[PDB]
Design a protein around this motif. Structure first.
Motif, PDB file in Angstrom:
ATOM      1  N   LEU A  79      52.710  58.092  38.598  1.00 44.21           N
ATOM      2  CA  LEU A  79      53.083  58.373  39.967  1.00 44.21           C
ATOM      3  C   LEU A  79      51.949  57.983  40.921  1.00 44.21           C
ATOM      4  N   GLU A  80      52.316  57.508  42.110  1.00 48.85           N
ATOM      5  CA  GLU A  80      51.346  57.111  43.128  1.00 48.85           C
ATOM      6  C   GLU A  80      50.500  55.870  42.824  1.00 48.85           C
TER       7      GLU A  80
ATOM      8  N   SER B 262      45.055  62.419  47.151  1.00 42.75           N
ATOM      9  CA  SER B 262      46.430  62.443  46.688  1.00 42.75           C
ATOM     10  C   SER B 262      47.024  63.830  46.546  1.00 42.75           C
ATOM     11  N   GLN B 263      48.029  64.126  47.367  1.00 47.03           N
ATOM     12  CA  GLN B 263      48.701  65.416  47.298  1.00 47.03           C
ATOM     13  C   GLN B 263      48.945  65.658  45.807  1.00 47.03           C
ATOM     14  N   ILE B 264      49.382  64.604  45.130  1.00 43.68           N
ATOM     15  CA  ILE B 264      49.703  64.647  43.716  1.00 43.68           C
ATOM     16  C   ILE B 264      48.563  65.024  42.783  1.00 43.68           C
ATOM     17  N   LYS B 265      47.526  64.196  42.701  1.00 43.34           N
ATOM     18  CA  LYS B 265      46.405  64.526  41.828  1.00 43.34           C
ATOM     19  C   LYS B 265      45.779  65.862  42.214  1.00 43.34           C
TER      20      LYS B 265
END
Ligand SMILES: [Mg+2]
Ligand SMILES: [Mg+2]
Ligand SMILES: [Mg+2]
Ligand SMILES: [Mg+2]
Ligand SMILES: [Mg+2]
Ligand SMILES: [Mg+2]
Ligand SMILES: [Mg+2]
Ligand SMILES: [Mg+2]
Ligand SMILES: [Mg+2]
Ligand SMILES: [Mg+2]
Ligand SMILES: [Mg+2]
Ligand SMILES: [Mg+2]
Ligand SMILES: [Mg+2]
Ligand SMILES: [Mg+2]
Ligand SMILES: [Mg+2]
Ligand SMILES: [Mg+2]
Ligand SMILES: [Mg+2]
Ligand SMILES: [Mg+2]
Ligand SMILES: [Mg+2]
Ligand SMILES: [Mg+2]
Ligand SMILES: [Mg+2]
Ligand SMILES: [Mg+2]
Ligand SMILES: [Mg+2]
Ligand SMILES: [Mg+2]
Ligand SMILES: [Mg+2]
Ligand SMILES: [Mg+2]
Ligand SMILES: [Mg+2]
Ligand SMILES: [Mg+2]
Ligand SMILES: [Mg+2]
Ligand SMILES: [Mg+2]
Ligand SMILES: [Mg+2]
Ligand SMILES: [Mg+2]
Ligand SMILES: [Mg+2]
Ligand SMILES: [Mg+2]
Ligand SMILES: [Mg+2]
Ligand SMILES: [Mg+2]
Ligand SMILES: [Mg+2]
Ligand SMILES: [Mg+2]
Ligand SMILES: [Mg+2]
Ligand SMILES: [Mg+2]
Ligand SMILES: [Mg+2]
Ligand SMILES: [Mg+2]
Ligand SMILES: [Mg+2]
Ligand SMILES: [Mg+2]
Ligand SMILES: [Mg+2]
Ligand SMILES: [Mg+2]
Ligand SMILES: [Mg+2]
Ligand SMILES: [Mg+2]
Ligand SMILES: [Mg+2]
Ligand SMILES: [Mg+2]
Ligand SMILES: [Mg+2]
Ligand SMILES: [Mg+2]
Ligand SMILES: [Mg+2]
Ligand SMILES: [Mg+2]
Ligand SMILES: [Mg+2]
Ligand SMILES: [Mg+2]
Ligand SMILES: [Mg+2]
Ligand SMILES: [Mg+2]
Ligand SMILES: [Mg+2]
Ligand SMILES: [Mg+2]
Ligand SMILES: [Mg+2]
Ligand SMILES: [Mg+2]
Ligand SMILES: [Mg+2]
Ligand SMILES: [Mg+2]
Ligand SMILES: [Mg+2]
Ligand SMILES: [Mg+2]
Ligand SMILES: [Mg+2]
Ligand SMILES: [Mg+2]
Ligand SMILES: [Mg+2]
Ligand SMILES: [Mg+2]
Lengths: 141, 351
Positions: A79-80, B262-265
């Motif tokens: 992702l990303e 990254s909002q994600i990481k």
RNA sequence: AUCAACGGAUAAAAGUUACCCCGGGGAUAACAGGCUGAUCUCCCCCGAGCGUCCACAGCGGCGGGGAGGUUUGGCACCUCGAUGUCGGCUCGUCGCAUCCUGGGGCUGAAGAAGGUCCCAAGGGUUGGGCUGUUCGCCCAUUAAAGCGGCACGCGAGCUGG
RNA sequence: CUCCUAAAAGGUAACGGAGGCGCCCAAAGGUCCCCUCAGGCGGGACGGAAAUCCGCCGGAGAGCGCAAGGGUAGAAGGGG
RNA sequence: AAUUCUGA
RNA sequence: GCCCGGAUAGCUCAGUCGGUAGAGCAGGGGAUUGAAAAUCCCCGUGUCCUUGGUUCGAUUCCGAGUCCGGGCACCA
RNA sequence: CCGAGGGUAGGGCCCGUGACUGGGGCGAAGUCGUAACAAGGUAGCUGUACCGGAAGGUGCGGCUGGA
RNA sequence: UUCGGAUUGGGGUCUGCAACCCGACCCCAUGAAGCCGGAAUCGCUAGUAAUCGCGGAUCAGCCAUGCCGCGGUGAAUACG
RNA sequence: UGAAACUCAAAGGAAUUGACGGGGGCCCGCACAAGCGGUGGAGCAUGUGGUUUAAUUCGAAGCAACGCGAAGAACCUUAC
């Protein structure tokens, strides 16, 4: 769950799905079976999640025959991360399935429990399915 | 044991409470909320089974010389008709008595004794080592797989620590009353003038339970917000929800993270911490439970013993019950099946 | 000849610039829009099993189908001969996926209270402590202290932390 | 350099899938003459489940200095 | 350049 | 996430061109001691992390994997 | 005018209390080493100085309660 | 090794009511470890040490290579 | 200059008699030294720890316990 224990190449191309099964159109194992109407890649997770759905329904009963096997490595980029930089990594496994393929089939159980343990599994599949019972094609003379 | 078992069971008490069950039982007082019904008959069976108890007693009492005729007449059938109801009797005699004791939570588990030498320094380190050989031999010959966890052979003599597994059934329920302080009196084999000193020790006992380690957290178990991070970044930091926030509703513990852009990481690192700090509250409560399973006693100093052992006056006084045998040597080598039952009787008495 | 940067610039060569400059580009990133919707939010199918009893009062294992276009992304289509970027303030207005208040079906609804789904924006939706904060936590209340879209509305309206 | 991608000529892109090369042989080279494998099944002192023997069956699945592919015993393989 | 010996 | 470096006896660590395997410590059996330490003889155990491959053979040379150690993740 | 007293402002003394922290007494058993008592195994102690897990060590001068 | 006699197979005598656990001997066949003993460590100053053989108590027999006695041969060294 | 709470039944001076000293003087003993023969190694006998067992009866534990009670355990003995 349910994946090969080998293969010569870890990742393989996406391929294409041109209708009509290559084979496995007839039911050559149990009494009643389940056949796919629309093409699709069934996931290992789905096959299993229907195999149990099956048993659990008629606990301690007949025998279930799974006639499709996920031997295609399915990939996906993290992702990303952006496009390029090599092919994504393996996610899980899928089994190719074209219209007419008898995926499953139950044996040694009443039609009452057949056309039900199947109706349930069907809801676990990403495609439309239809139920059948041994008929026209049989291996004899 | 055999002749005495009866009395201490509510022998005369129970047979009076028994009819108190059936007492309120009959007369279905608008049997609404279900309550006694459950522990209604089960508590009842206990009752009239004191007869099956006096039948296996009588059949085993009328058995004292229930072979005086078999000492005069060996071949027959009028003497082999009650016997198939006498072999089974000497069996329940033990049953309805040790199935009234071990009658508590989880005993059938494999146990885990631990020996730490109390006061008396080196003496206690040795007296400890002896207390070790004891249960070992015992549990050993008792038909129990004994696995040695630890053994820290202390300074000058004996040991400092010991912990062993007791593989078998009701192993815990047996080696349970042992849990506690054990005193030893004899002239100190270590002291110079073989003078007379007292030794102390600690013997803890616990059931084997936890084997796995699972700590997964459902999504609804938490909550995740996202906001604009605080810090350097020009247009970036200004128009992006890079800053995350995991909150575990039940514990209330929350974690925030703007480590990377990254909002994600950041959710990742976030939960990564959250979990870590959740096992810590998981192990903090994972031991305040199992530690309250050690007891509420044992300062391991003087006057805490629950059964002393003497050797220059050959005896063994169990303070808990009052019992006092005259064979320390035998006890310290297996002989326990006597004080173990009694130990229970004393305990289970209050539950 | 690891002229290996392998058709081989010199025989011979690394960094730094937030002190910077010029020529160019929306051929190319960062904002906003766009397309996509993996991520996100909401919804639904199946019915294992939970609920003393009983799959569906309240729940839904494994799997499965969608919607929306708030978020993090993918792409790089207008804009680099300039589309001012967070929060606050001011002014609002629209949505409904309803926080109150109005209706209504279930309930594991005695009643008073609740729970869940349905209909329904007309109007309402407080004051403070901390931080630039959005977000949050807390104090004191309240019928309620809703969630969003408007270039994450609004700097030729202000502020400028 | 080798396969695939590559759509049955050739060619064909991507920070597509997967591996090798920067050496080596004076015999691993010329030619002439011979020889034929890997395995599997039984029999055999030491002997693994392959050491060397014996016997049947084995068309190439062996070998060809090293990657892959094509080729190949009617020899490119083994010996002089 | 050679320690320590608890507690009736 | 990227790129380096690791894993070998119970602990801390060497080691080789591919056949081998070690040290200090702990530990077991003895010896002095009244009894411990210290000291003194005798000792041994390891898939050299996992899983593939190359080779005739792999601790070792390559693919991958897991855990740990470092270094970077900057302009907006 | 003075005036009890009440208010306002700043001082002084004492009591109580305070997260934390200093060292002390006690505590029939721990861990570390062994400073002092016998030339105590470098004689000890002493005022002071510097040092060190800890007793302690060492320097300078003093005493003998040591040789 | 004609050293050394362990272990073991087979055949016998005797005591005892009876010797499988558990007897001592006898005879045939086996013939093992052991080529002078690591760190350590004991005894003896003269008829002693070392060495050879005999006796008794116990006691049916006997696991005595033990203990208590007897004599036969007969050393070394002691600065301090 | 200079307290207290708290805590202990003692702290302490000198001088006795001993024990002790990596204090001294003097002096003995197979204590060392001088010398000879052994033990630890090997197989076997026996005692003991230990473990094992239904039981492997009990005691003795440094020198001064371990071929010691046992100057005789097949059942007796014999206590298990
Ligand atoms: Mg399988
Ligand atoms: Mg077609
Ligand atoms: Mg301790
Ligand atoms: Mg420990
Ligand atoms: Mg910056
Ligand atoms: Mg952005
Ligand atoms: Mg050039
Ligand atoms: Mg170059
Ligand atoms: Mg070029
Ligand atoms: Mg250059
Ligand atoms: Mg500056
Ligand atoms: Mg300037
Ligand atoms: Mg400057
Ligand atoms: Mg300039
Ligand atoms: Mg410019
Ligand atoms: Mg563009
Ligand atoms: Mg353009
Ligand atoms: Mg954009
Ligand atoms: Mg625009
Ligand atoms: Mg699901
Ligand atoms: Mg938008
Ligand atoms: Mg976007
Ligand atoms: Mg383009
Ligand atoms: Mg621009
Ligand atoms: Mg313009
Ligand atoms: Mg303009
Ligand atoms: Mg609505
Ligand atoms: Mg109501
Ligand atoms: Mg304000
Ligand atoms: Mg403020
Ligand atoms: Mg709004
Ligand atoms: Mg804005
Ligand atoms: Mg500013
Ligand atoms: Mg300013
Ligand atoms: Mg072609
Ligand atoms: Mg073509
Ligand atoms: Mg062959
Ligand atoms: Mg072989
Ligand atoms: Mg040729
Ligand atoms: Mg030739
Ligand atoms: Mg020393
Ligand atoms: Mg110490
Ligand atoms: Mg003392
Ligand atoms: Mg290691
Ligand atoms: Mg080797
Ligand atoms: Mg070593
Ligand atoms: Mg040792
Ligand atoms: Mg030792
Ligand atoms: Mg070794
Ligand atoms: Mg006044
Ligand atoms: Mg104060
Ligand atoms: Mg001092
Ligand atoms: Mg000292
Ligand atoms: Mg000194
Ligand atoms: Mg010293
Ligand atoms: Mg000084
Ligand atoms: Mg110093
Ligand atoms: Mg001085
Ligand atoms: Mg015999
Ligand atoms: Mg010798
Ligand atoms: Mg000799
Ligand atoms: Mg004064
Ligand atoms: Mg004095
Ligand atoms: Mg002298
Ligand atoms: Mg003499
Ligand atoms: Mg020997
Ligand atoms: Mg006695
Ligand atoms: Mg004994
Ligand atoms: Mg004897
Ligand atoms: Mg007897």
């Amino acid at each position: 769950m349910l994946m090969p224990r080998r293969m010569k190449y870890r990742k393989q191309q996406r391929g294409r799905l041109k209708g009509a099964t290559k084979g496995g159109d007839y039911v050559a194992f149990g009494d009643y079976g389940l056949v796919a109407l629309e093409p699709a890649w069934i996931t290992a997770q789905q096959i299993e999640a229907a195999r149990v759905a099956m048993v659990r329904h008629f606990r301690r009963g007949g025998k279930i025959f799974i006639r499709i096997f996920p031997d295609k490595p399915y990939t996906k980029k993290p992702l990303e991360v952006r496009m390029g930089k090599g092919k994504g990594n393996v996610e899980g496994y899928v089994a190719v399935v074209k219209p007419g393929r008898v995926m499953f089939e139950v044996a040694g159980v009443t039609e009452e429990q057949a056309m039900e343990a199947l109706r349930i599994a069907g809801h676990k599949l990403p495609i439309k399915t239809k139920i059948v019972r041994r008929d026209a094609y049989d291996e004899a003379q | 044991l055999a002749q005495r078992l009866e009395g201490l069971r509510g022998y005369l008490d129970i047979p009076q409470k028994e009819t108190r069950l059936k007492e309120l039982e009959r007369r279905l007082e608008d049997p609404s909320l279900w309550n006694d019904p459950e522990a209604a008959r089960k508590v009842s069976q206990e009752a009239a089974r004191l007869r099956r108890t006096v039948d296996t007693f009588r059949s085993l009492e009328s058995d004292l010389q229930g072979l005086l005729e078999l000492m005069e007449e060996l071949p027959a059938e009028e003497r082999e008709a009650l016997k198939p109801e006498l072999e089974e009797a000497a069996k329940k005699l033990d049953e309805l008595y040790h199935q009234t004791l071990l009658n508590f939570p989880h005993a059938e588990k494999n146990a885990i004794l631990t020996i730490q030498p109390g006061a008396g320094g080196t003496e206690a380190c040795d007296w400890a080592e002896m207390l070790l050989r004891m249960y070992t031999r015992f549990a050993e010959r008792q038909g129990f797989q004994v696995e040695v966890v630890d053994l820290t052979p202390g300074p000058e003599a004996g040991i400092d620590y010991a912990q062993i597994l007791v593989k078998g059934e009701n192993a815990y329920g047996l080696l349970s009353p042992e849990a506690g302080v054990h005193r030893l009196v004899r002239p100190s084999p270590f002291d110079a003038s073989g003078r007379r000193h007292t030794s102390f020790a600690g013997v803890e006992v616990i059931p084997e339970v936890d084997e796995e380690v699972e700590v997964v957290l459902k999504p609804e178990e938490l909550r995740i917000d996202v906001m604009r991070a605080s810090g350097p970044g020009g247009q970036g930091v200004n128009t992006t929800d890079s800053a995350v926030r995991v909150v575990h509703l039940p514990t209330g513990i929350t974690v925030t993270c703007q480590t990377t852009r990254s909002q994600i990481k950041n959710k990742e690192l976030a939960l990564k911490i959250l979990k870590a700090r959740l096992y810590e509250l998981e192990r903090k409560k994972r031991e305040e439970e199992l530690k309250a399973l050690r007891g509420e006693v044992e300062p391991i100093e003087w006057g805490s013993q629950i059964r002393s052992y003497v050797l220059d006056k050959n005896y063994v006084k169990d303070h808990r019950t009052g019992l006092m045998r005259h064979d320390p040597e035998n006890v310290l080598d297996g002989d326990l099946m006597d004080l173990i039952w009694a130990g229970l009787e004393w305990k289970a008495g209050r539950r």
